[model samples]
Target: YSDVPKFIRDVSIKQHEWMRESIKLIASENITSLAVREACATDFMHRYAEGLPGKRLYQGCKYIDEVETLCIELSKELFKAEHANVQPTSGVVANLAVFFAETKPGDKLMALSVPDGGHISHWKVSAAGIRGLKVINHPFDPEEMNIDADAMVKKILEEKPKLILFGGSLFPFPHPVADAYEAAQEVGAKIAYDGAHVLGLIAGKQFQDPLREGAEYLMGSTHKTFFGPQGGVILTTKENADKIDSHVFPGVHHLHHKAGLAIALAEMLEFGEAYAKQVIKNAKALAQALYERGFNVLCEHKTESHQVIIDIESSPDIEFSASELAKMYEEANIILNKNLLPWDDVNNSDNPSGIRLGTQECTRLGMKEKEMEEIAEFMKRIAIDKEKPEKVREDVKEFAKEYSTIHYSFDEGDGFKYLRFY
Candidate 1:
């Protein structure tokens, strides 16, 4: 009969089967290796050990203690931080915890504008609102497509915010981390880097070094460009580590997901530098390729990070709304997401004018610059030539079948494994 377990099994198997024939280009998603994936499926998935490794709220946490210790140590080693908090269930939670750790209810903080690629976590409507903090926006330089350093410095000095935040959701270029950090220093304010989209790039030394550049705290999700299950992390100096740790334990829920902790350890140990390097390389290449094909990929003239946003509104004769374009791409066995451009109204979120793509998931499936070139051509066919999505879908499926094994990881996992959480 159709019991709950059977229903879960049925949907899961179909999802794994469907994913095998498709390409994933979501900017904020990545595939874990077999070792990490398998670890997430273990008995630890349901268990919890509150507090740190040795200290716990439950018994039978000895193995969990060992795993947590390794995870925290590896994270510290990888990010080059004096302290690491391997909790904070998600990237948003991590950012929220930072607010609780460092700010009072009515404290003032500063961040880039959401239209300028900032995540909502930094917006007053989200974390800052709940924390009862006031937010100040940085100066936007359209020509540079980032904050104007001189203007930003001037703003920091004038605002004298208690905290200054850097990094963004649509981040294609590095922020002036060092420059802003200096301004933050003059005001005796703490600086934080939200590396959710580029954490793995940082580990591989392909992205800017926030800690070295003088940001006091680094927070991010482990699954975006990094090799791990869905969870968040914090890396900071020893001076502020305790406060951050306190917020994660007592402020947020206790006993953050243990499976993610174990999975994150396996990912860091197995993938590390080499894996991160490839992910960045793939992103830049794909961005360049798409821009060449007239896809209006932002910051393609300059350097880009892991994400590429294609502007449908600017492209010649292309009329699909971001969501429609996304649906069209999905029909061609390509998975991506709709995104609002800087000028678009945030109210148009569900039907925005741009689509966002990233190379991490596609790169993990063994595609490279050459594969990116091919993917661009596929996109050109749909966007420019207006080819039937069914035809494109068939070709994509055939192409996807060749890269059936996961690359740049420990186990060299099968892309369509039986363990794909059907």
Candidate 2:
């Protein structure tokens, strides 16, 4: 207890116990494998290997070089890109690096707006905005539940932005990267894709290939769909590799690359396909189940990918909004986060009218489509029959206990202590 912060240790214990007895349905979260945890927990925190592998600005970096090299090779292989840089500390850093590498301050950049399915990192209040860059946003088609690529092309022509940054936080349909790239090219703009939410799907060949689809650079988190480490990576063609590499080193990352990269590479090599495929399957199954539960799920169309966005308004008798539903389910031991629907009524900061749930954590626990159906039913009971909250809590606890054997372990003795990191 002395070695760890009491609050940290308490939170770890609570989270571990929660995982052992609760169902997690958050989209942007997942449970890492034991191997990935071991790599991240390496106690080589004081060592620093500035710059790239062999050209390190410090002494004694032969092993670090191998680690970085392996991580880079694995990333390139997993994503089928010409070059890979597995050094950025997080997905935010990766995207920042891309912005820095591709264009300068005051250059126009466009992405989806947060309320309309964009990440805050791409917003005006973020570093991207602070850099003096002009940030424009694309709109989503209410009926299609996807970005309006044709309208975005018109914006590109009108704005003549230096770069077209596409992709989103609530990505259901595949982005029209090729079409957008062609349109950007017409205006002499370069295309960069932020696939932070769909890298695993892309690696598994279940999602669109941004790099091959005409985007000049691709940046994403390794964990989401990839089920790798909690870090960021950038992949691009050989033409822009050196620039991206330089931007990452000295410009963004000044060393501390060994553990994160090594762990990400190992997981990408080992679990890329299987984990990605399972995640998609679980998402589809869960979506279908939620729809069957009389909830109006967003993106009911066939073009959707790895998420099910539920509109709580569909159940009028239920007095709670999506945020309320999230709190209700949380009380019942069902983990999920409130999210705003595309056309939600309330403000994003408070009473949003929608909830975003995914099957990443469930699939990580080795649950399949059949299990997804059961989990969906559980969600239905919690949301629809809120009167029986006590009963729902007990049922969820029982269900979670049945899956406790799937505990994550770094080594045999290490067990599942690290599941609390999230």
Kindly report which residue pairs in candidate 1 clash with one another.
12-422
**CA deviation > 4 Å runs, candidate 1:** 253-266, 420-422
- All candidates' lDDT scores? 0.77, 0.72
Q: Worst 10-residue stretch by lDDT in candidate 1?
A: 251-260
The reply for model 2, stretches above 4 Å from the true place, is 1-7, 253-264, 345-348, 404-415, 418-422
Q: Per-residue lDDT for 147-243 in model 2, tens only?
A: 7788888888776777888778778888788878776988778888888787767776776778778888888887676556677888888887678
Backbone clash total, candidate 2: 1
lDDT score for residue 137 of model 2:
75
